Amino acid sequence: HMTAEVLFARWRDRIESQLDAALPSPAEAPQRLHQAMRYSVLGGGKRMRPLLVYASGHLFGTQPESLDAAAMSVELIHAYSLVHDDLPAMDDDALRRGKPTTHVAFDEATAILAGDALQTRAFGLLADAPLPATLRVACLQTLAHASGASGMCGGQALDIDATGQQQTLAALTRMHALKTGALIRAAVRMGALCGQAHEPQLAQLDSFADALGLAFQVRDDILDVEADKSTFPALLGMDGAKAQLHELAARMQSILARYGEEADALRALATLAVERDH
Amino acid sequence: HMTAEVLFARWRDRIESQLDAALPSPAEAPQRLHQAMRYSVLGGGKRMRPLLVYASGHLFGTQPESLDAAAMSVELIHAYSLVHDDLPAMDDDALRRGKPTTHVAFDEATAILAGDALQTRAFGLLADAPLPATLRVACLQTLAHASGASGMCGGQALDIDATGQQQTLAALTRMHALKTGALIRAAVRMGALCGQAHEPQLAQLDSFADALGLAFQVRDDILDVESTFPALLGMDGAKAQLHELAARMQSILARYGEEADALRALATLAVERDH
Numbered sequence: 134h135m136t137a138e139v140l141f142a143r144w145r146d147r148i149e150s151q152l153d154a155a156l157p158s159p160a161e162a163p164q165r166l167h168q169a170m171r172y173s174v175l176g177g178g179k180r181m182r183p184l185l186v187y188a189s190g191h192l193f194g195t196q197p198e199s200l201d202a203a204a205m206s207v208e209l210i211h212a213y214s215l216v217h218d219d220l221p222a223m224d225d226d227a228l229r230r231g232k233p234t235t236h237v238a239f240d241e242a243t244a245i246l247a248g249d250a251l252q253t254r255a256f257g258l259l260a261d262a263p264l265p266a267t268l269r270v271a272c273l274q275t276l277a278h279a280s281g282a283s284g285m286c287g288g289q290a291l292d293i294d295a296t297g298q299q300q301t302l303a304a305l306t307r308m309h310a311l312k313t314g315a316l317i318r319a320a321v322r323m324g325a326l327c328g329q330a331h332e333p334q335l336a337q338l339d340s341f342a343d344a345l346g347l348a349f350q351v352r353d354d355i356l357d358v359e360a361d362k363s364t365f366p367a368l369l370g371m372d373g374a375k376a377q378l379h380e381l382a383a384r385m386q387s388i389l390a391r392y393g394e395e396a397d398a399l400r401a402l403a404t405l406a407v408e409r410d411h
Numbered sequence: 412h413m414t415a416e417v418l419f420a421r422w423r424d425r426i427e428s429q430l431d432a433a434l435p436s437p438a439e440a441p442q443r444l445h446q447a448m449r450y451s452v453l454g455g456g457k458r459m460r461p462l463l464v465y466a467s468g469h470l471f472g473t474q475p476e477s478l479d480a481a482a483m484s485v486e487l488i489h490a491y492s493l494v495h496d497d498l499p500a501m502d503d504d505a506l507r508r509g510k511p512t513t514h515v516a517f518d519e520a521t522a523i524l525a526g527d528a529l530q531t532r533a534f535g536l537l538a539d540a541p542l543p544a545t546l547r548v549a550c551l552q553t554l555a556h557a558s559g560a561s562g563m564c565g566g567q568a569l570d571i572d573a574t575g576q577q578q579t580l581a582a583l584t585r586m587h588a589l590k591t592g593a594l595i596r597a598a599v600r601m602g603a604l605c606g607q608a609h610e611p612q613l614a615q616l617d618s619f620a621d622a623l624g625l626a627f628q629v630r631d632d633i634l635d636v637e638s639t640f641p642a643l644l645g646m647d648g649a650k651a652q653l654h655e656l657a658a659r660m661q662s663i664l665a666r667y668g669e670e671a672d673a674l675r676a677l678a679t680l681a682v683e684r685d686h
């Protein structure tokens with residue numbers, strides 16, 4: 134059995150190649166839109182959401198060809214959300230991962246439309262997947278529920294509404310559950326659906342994915358202090374937030390404790406969510 | 412087309428009620444996003460694209476209940492595209508239909524997100540529809556292809572890229588075929604799929620829908636004056652092109668019985684409307 138480290142490298146290379154083939158060429162008109170779409174999603178990175186799709190499918194022995202559309206779709210939703218988030222009317226960021234944000238590299242109109250078109254391509258890839266129609270529909274329902282006003286978009290809105298206000302712990306947790314937790318749970322659910330998981334196992338994996346999405350954000354908050362006025366270290370104290378993260382780490386491992394080596398990839402994504410330095 | 416007008420009023424009332432039931436409550440969190448989503452699609456309008464879905468299904472005797480998801484989805488895509496198109500970085504409009512645009516009634520960030528969420532809701536409604544999964548997938552494929560970079564979004568980008576430039580007649584026609592032609596064809600296609608249409612009928616209806624989308628744009632350009640088709644062809648040349656499209660649309664549907672009257676009336680509307 135291949136180690137988690139080897140699997141993550143293989144899946145990161147795989148999703149890079151799949152996304153490159155799935156996006157329109159920069160030489161086809163409209164060239165600026167296509168260039169901006171590619172600029173916004175190609176070029177590496179953690180690929181946490183594709184990795185969750187593959188790692189979840191891996192629990193069931195599912196081949197990557199059955200997972201590629203689901204894995205691309207969650208990265209495309211994630212990528213589009215960041216293109217819009219970076220806009221001057223939103224978070225107003227000029228740099229992302231050491232490179233100019235998409236609206237700086239191009240312009241705001243191009244960034245708006247590139248985000249719009251990446252969202253459509255996420256759904257199109259699922260609808261076009263070489264899978265049974267019932268499975269494509271189940272994946273599409275999952276992604277839509279997690280990405281819209283009941284998930285990612287709603288969480289973005291809760292965040293914008295809270296600009297300049299101090300959120301309570303309850304409200305901060307709820308905001309993160311929508312803004313990033315929902316799409317992280319969708320990634321795990323879709324991988325397991327492609328693995329033909331049944332509902333009890335879907336619910337168990339959802340409990341793991343729920344904890345992982347929060348863990349990632351608590352860790353991020355801790356790192357920000359070590360390197361949206363309300364954060365887990367500000368509301369809990371730094372020691373309290375570290376204890377919160379430590380419990381989520383233990384919780385994630387306990388949920389998967391009965392699996393064999395087939396869960397090592399998911400286990401390692403949990404460790405990365407808790408322990409990464411960047 | 413008076414009997415058709417009654418049908419269209421029924422369908423405009425129906426799609427208003429359907430969209431109202433499908434959108435989140437303005438009392439529930441996040442309230443401002445939900446309110447902006449509702450502002451951006453409720454409150455009447457022509458409902459051309461839902462009417463095309465219902466009328467295309469009507470050709471096959473399909474009842475509206477089997478068409479609501481598809482009809483809502485094309486209006487939601489259309490609605491989101493206008494919210495983003497009105498933004499200052501795009502067309503920069505303060506009014507639409509005599510009322511403030513969404514980013515004026517709310518703010519730019521809320522409008523961006525409302526557009527994003529309406530797009531998602533369009534896909535979720537089709538995916539959740541009470542229809543065979545194979546039919547839901549075919550409609551979802553149709554909508555995604557027509558709405559993204561190879562359709563509506565691509566046409567919007569072409570339009571912005573040509574700002575201040577003189578376009579050839581071919582380029583302008585290509586731009587409109589993506590910018591609004593694709594989603595109009597999608598509406599007719601989805602109605603026909605829900606009607607269990609056979610491949611020749613789908614191709615026939617797609618020829619009709621292609622002509623209808625162009626005619627609708629040519630008529631909106633003519634009304635706007637009262638690079639565009641009037642600018643390239645003259646006001647008289649634009650009107651001649653409209654009449655040729657009208658005759659093509661009626662020719663394509665000519666062999667059908669009264670079940671095509673709804674589509675025929677939408678063709679007449681696209682050409683003759685004062686609004």
Ligand SMILES: [Cl-]
Pocket residue numbers: 134135
């Ligand atoms: Cl292996």
